[PDB]
Write a protein that binds this ligand. Structure first.
Ligand code: HEM
Ligand code: HEM
Lengths: 726, 726
């Protein structure tokens, strides 16, 4: 029952490209990657090699293949304590998944600021460019269960736990800069509406159903984040290629006591990139684990996800200077009005060891702040402060969830709290209360001050009556949707129109569709008309005369709201499919791989069967996957080298592979006789931008391909794809 | 007054076809469909129309849109108890999902036996053909989470709770007649191997990964159920079109105390029908809820799932008369050797009201037997008896899960058990122990007898030493795999080969694929060579010389092991896509739609946009979905009527619709100018079997199409689908 002779069961503990080795727990793949938090988990890491198999009480097991029975065909005996312990632990494996964001993928890394921020905040983790803060990040979808698919259309969660020297700070954000609703009291309404409908629990991972669009049509506050969801923001290529936002306005407090309003941003250093809808939806079927896999593999390859932290900063005296309320989380602050100041860089550089222990049990909370940070009255933030504490007690089984290893602070913690289910800490303090004399009052309160001080809330002025009332300043719902719409490129606008049209086609009750279209007519007539036409709906004269909402503080657009208007492409860590034949021209392949390797782009070698093929020069080429097994959905570009093209010329899967990649706007490159495939994608002989072609794969061919890949997708091909049957 | 004035928000309370009306809770869709269990749930059903919104304490709420704050832009106040109750209930909505079979879809129904089985069992529910037993049935996949996809390749669970007059009997079976392992002590091993891998929690809903095939390769007892899983059995078309089996040998006990060995069968009255792999995998992307949806809609349409319960019965004296052990759950009993005796009929005729409350909380247990039934020493069954009790106490929150409405017996239950979390029953008995005099010893024990007697175990002789030892009678692993293989049609054998080949290609460590292939060579050389060829592996001369395993009691095949070898087609409840154009020939459509209606086959009218088109004669045709919105994966056949074909002839989606349906072996029917689509699928001029074509949709056009549909798929097409890039 043993390992192969050749040690091929065990992956190399060295960075390797996706597919080259079986993936492995982080501490075994990258044992020399350390930080303070990863080190501190060492008390609970358990190995296995050379150890005897035992019960949980330490008793060695002789026979782990059989129950104890009276004779070998007899009844199982109740005294089999080994069987019952093993079955009981199995029987009790599951815990409640998260009520939202149950589907998520996490990794370890570190953060450091570029320069001390002491002028605007006394937060210790921002005080020194050479003081490094361990982090654990979990990225997530929102709607679906923990076993749902990665590449659904949904908002994404982006939660970062900072293990600072002055306490855990969790920054619990999303990949769009606003939320659907204004006041936390409506959260259960909204989430019930987007989640599977309660009679039949359908659909998973999708807003494309009646109840979501019903709530939307009756709650126009939702429309801004709905625009972002229906755009390609809702289908990121990778967690590495999306933006992050805290959404709410928070405060920074400096040593002088000055408060500055702040909104938090993460910039992906790999650039912004999203799938297209047909590709994203098909990919939930071909690989429901695509984003989880891609994140794990990037870290195993050395393509560490990196993000830049950035702050939009607004002085206290400028609180009311915009035509939107800063405390309204359905409103974004355009970068054109308030730029993002770069603050520091976060690098995710190691995977967990056990997904359940570290990812499933991690607990983040936006209420987890530190001195130098504070809240505001944002009525959605205010309610979140209550919710995460409450849900985690039942999800994680009691109030000692901070003792679960992943959640533990790395800085000191001491207090008079005691007991609770699964209490780990054995307190020796003779006192469990303060004030006490019997322990000289330790642990003691600490006055606030410039560093290492106790937490004190900023003394904000509160004046008003106890009311359940939405601020009048929050009652404007169309101008930000329209700013977003106007800031998208034409192809991005088309994909938005296609998102609304596809989703509303799945709404069974037609008046719900009509009411949503009426809401679109309040944002932009061109958008409303394009959706209406796809739905066979005709706008009335009144609808055509709805006056468009005002510009946002004179802005007619802000290109930072577009994924693509401003190029920010980075090809490192992207992947190319190379479609092999049984007599590959080894000169083509040499040049291809050399150029890819120079830019940090990975390759997957594909064929019509598994095993190996032999190139013209005797080189044996191992096959990663079949054309069916690793579809074009899972790669960024396709390259077909010369060789014996007749081997694959009439293979349906190989032809379809090119048709699918072509449809989904990916760069394709064809060398030598592979150019015969130009017929399948049915498109000229002078060639076309987006298809690289040459007698062979030279320097120039690869440079062209690599340039297209830096632009992510071939948008100019869009008019050509409605004709292809794929 | 948010409801539309025309009342179109509310589905009609009468049977309607899939897509015609919004779906609804069962008691609102079908209020007149009643049984004793459904009636008994009336005490906990809660309505809503005309009632005030309240807290859970009954306090009316005035403003469910806002939190209580100090000023309309101020902080939220801790005194907002309305907000806190609503968010707390929300925060605590989730419970742990089931450890296996977390993904499942359920319905209410009723069972009746065909005749009294008093001669072989004193079970009350089988005593009288006029005795109706309410049932609740849940069908499930096994590996994936509750939010994973339906049409994965997996075993399916088929669990039936019989609410009998002498106790709940749960028949907790699968859709194949054997299990992967022999002894319950290995269940955590096997389940851990198939489930997502522990470092990264990948893959969901798939056995296509290293750990599963590592375990299979080291445990040849698994091979028989592995053959079933790799066959089209692993991908059923519908829960309505798969077989059910209790797997284990149990006993029936009659009034005279005679024991008869029994294995339980469910026969689907709708026939056996499965998907093909590329279809199944893509459908997990296009509609991960396809089986759940299909079940619910069948019941809403009146296409009630019906199954015939059947027994294979073996006299006690015949225990040792087979080449295989009756207590070995990796062995099936061939129907050629022991026929299934028809026992009664089960009809599922009403959906749940609330999925969580009825489906998610339902608890089934194979240990829930009734007098007239008993267990055997099958060492897998023996361990199951321990596990379900134990898991349900954590899953459902305590020992009073039998008081959760869906789980309650409809017969009396009284005993001395008290307390426990969530105790609903208020016991008035002065006594909580027996024997007692202070309540005259009530409730009292009941002697066993012919009817209404207490449970007494059959007095089976036990003789042996206490051993953890597998019976040598269980040590044979290849003959049942071979009998299965040899019983499959040539196309089924091909789909088995492709299943192994596809799955093994995703195993990253090659030696593992090699080891599986070796195991295949012990089953059947043709099978092993064909998988080997697809994996680029050459068998050794030793491998080529392995002698096949013996026949199973002289049988070299049993056709009842095939899905298709014996026609059992049933078209009622199936569905056809009809591809519209903007001037449909209304005569073809009247004939098409009435032909389908007469046989109970549903239609979905499809186009390039939503809304309406107008037929040649002015008939308005309402559009159900777009070509991309409702892909050929979701239908059984496709019909293209004549009209203005030019409207859709260049539509890539409309052409691809036919390609996809063609590839997946579905019947396609083309009327008049729709025959121009023959070129998209490469159909010869003189036609081919599996494509119905005529000048018009009259005469025998619809009969021929319906004949194809009764045979499910056009298997003869398999060699043709190899070209076609789809
Ligand atoms: C700006 C709007 C919000 C954002 C950006 C957001 C973000 C997130 C994220 C990223 C997670 C997952 C953390 C993880 O990976 O474990 C999460 C979980 C959760 N959120 Fe929020 N959220 C928002 C609004 C709300 C509201 C209004 C409430 C309720 C008042 C709420 C309650 C919850 C709950 C109960 C969890 C599960 C936490 C756990 O089980 O540990 N969220 N949220
Ligand atoms: C012939 C073999 C088996 C069959 C046919 C089978 C069938 C099933 C089915 C259909 C379910 C889902 C019931 C539902 O819909 O809620 C289930 C659940 C479950 N099974 Fe089995 N099973 C088998 C073997 C085992 C074994 C050997 C064990 C452990 C010793 C086991 C432990 C469990 C557990 C813990 C659950 C979850 C039950 C709950 O949470 O209510 N099963 N089984």
């Amino acid at each position: 029952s043993l390992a192969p002779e050749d040690g091929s069961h065990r992956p190399a503990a060295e960075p390797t490209p996706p597919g080259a080795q079986p993936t492995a727990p982080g501490s075994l793949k990258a044992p020399d990657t350390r930080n303070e938090k990863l080190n501190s988990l060492e008390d609970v890491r358990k190995g296995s090699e050379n150890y005897a198999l035992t019960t949980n009480q330490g008793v060695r097991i002789a026979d782990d293949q059989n129950s104890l029975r009276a004779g070998s065909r007899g009844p199982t005996l109740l005294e089999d304590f080994i069987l019952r312990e093993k079955i009981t632990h199995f029987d009790h494996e599951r815990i409640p998944e998260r009520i939202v964001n149950a589907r998520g993928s996490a990794a370890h890394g570190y953060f450091q600021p570029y320069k001390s921020l002491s002028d605007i905040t006394k937060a210790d983790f921002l005080s020194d460019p050479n003081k490094i803060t361990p982090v654990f990040v979990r990225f997530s979808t929102v709607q679906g269960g923990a076993g749902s698919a990665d590449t659904v259309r949904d908002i994404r969660g982006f939660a970062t736990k900072f293990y600072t020297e002055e306490g855990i700070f969790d920054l619990v954000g999303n990949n769009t800069p606003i939320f659907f609703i204004q006041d936390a009291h409506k959260f259960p309404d909204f989430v019930h509406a987007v989640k599977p409908e309660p009679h039949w629990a359908i659909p998973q991972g999708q807003s494309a159903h009646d109840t979501f669009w019903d709530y939307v049509s009756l709650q126009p506050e939702t429309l801004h984040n709905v625009m972002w969801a229906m755009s390609d923001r809702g289908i990121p290529r990778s967690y590495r290629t999306m933006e992050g936002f805290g959404i709410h306005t928070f405060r920074l407090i400096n040593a002088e006591g000055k408060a500055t309003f702040v909104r938090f941003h993460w910039k992906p250093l790999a650039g912004k990139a999203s799938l297209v809808w047909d590709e994203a939806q098909k990919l939930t079927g071909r690989d429901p684990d695509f984003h989880r896999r891609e994140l794990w593999e990037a870290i195993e390859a050395g393509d560490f996800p990196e993000y830049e932290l950035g702050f939009q900063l607004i002085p206290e005296e400028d609180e009311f200077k915009f035509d939107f309320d800063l405390l309204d989380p359905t409103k974004l602050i355009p970068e054109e009005l308030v730029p993002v100041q770069r603050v520091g860089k976060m690098v995710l550089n190691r995977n967990p060891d056990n997904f359940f222990a570290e990812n499933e049990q991690a607990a983040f909370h936006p209420g987890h702040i530190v001195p130098g940070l504070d809240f505001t009255n944002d009525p959605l933030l205010q309610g979140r402060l209550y919710s995460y504490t409450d849900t985690q007690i039942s999800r994680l089984g009691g109030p000692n969830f901070h003792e679960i290893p992943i959640n533990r602070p790395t800085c000191p913690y001491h207090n008079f709290q005691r007991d609770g289910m699964h209490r780990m800490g054995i307190d020796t303090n003779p006192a469990n209360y303060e004030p006490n004399s019997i322990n000289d009052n330790w642990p003691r309160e600490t006055p606030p001050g410039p560093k290492r001080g106790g937490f004190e809330s900023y003394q904000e002025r509160v004046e008003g009556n106890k009311v359940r009332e939405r601020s009048p300043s929050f009652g404007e719902y169309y101008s930000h949707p329209r700013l977003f719409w106007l800031s998208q490129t034409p192809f991005e606008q088309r994909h938005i129109v296609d998102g609304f049209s596809f989703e509303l086609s799945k709404v069974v009750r037609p008046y719900i569709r009509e009411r949503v279209v009426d809401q679109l007519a309040h944002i932009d007539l061109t958008l409303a008309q394009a959706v209406a036409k796809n739905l066979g709906i005709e706008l009335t004269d009144d609808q055509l005369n709805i006056t468009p909402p005002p510009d946002v503080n004179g802005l007619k657009k802000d290109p930072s709201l577009s994924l693509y208007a401003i190029p920010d492409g980075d090809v490192k860590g992207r992947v190319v499919a190379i479609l092999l034949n049984d007599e590959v021209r080894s000169a083509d392949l040499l040049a291809i791989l050399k150029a890819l390797k120079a830019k940090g782009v990975h390759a997957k070698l594909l064929y019509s069967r598994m095993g190996e093929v032999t190139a013209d020069d005797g080189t044996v080429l191992p096959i990663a996957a079949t054309f069916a097994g690793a579809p074009s959905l899972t790669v960024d570009a396709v390259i077909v080298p010369c060789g014996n093209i007749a081997d694959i010329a009439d293979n349906g899967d190989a032809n379809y592979y090119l048709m699918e990649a072509y449809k989904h706007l990916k760069p394709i490159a064809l060398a030598g006789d592979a150019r015969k495939f130009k017929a399948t994608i049915k498109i000229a002989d002078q060639g076309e931008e987006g298809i690289v072609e040459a007698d062979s794969a030279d320097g120039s061919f690869m440079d062209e391909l690599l340039t297209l890949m830096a632009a992510h997708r071939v948008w100019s091909r869009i008019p050509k794809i409605d004709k292809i049957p794929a």
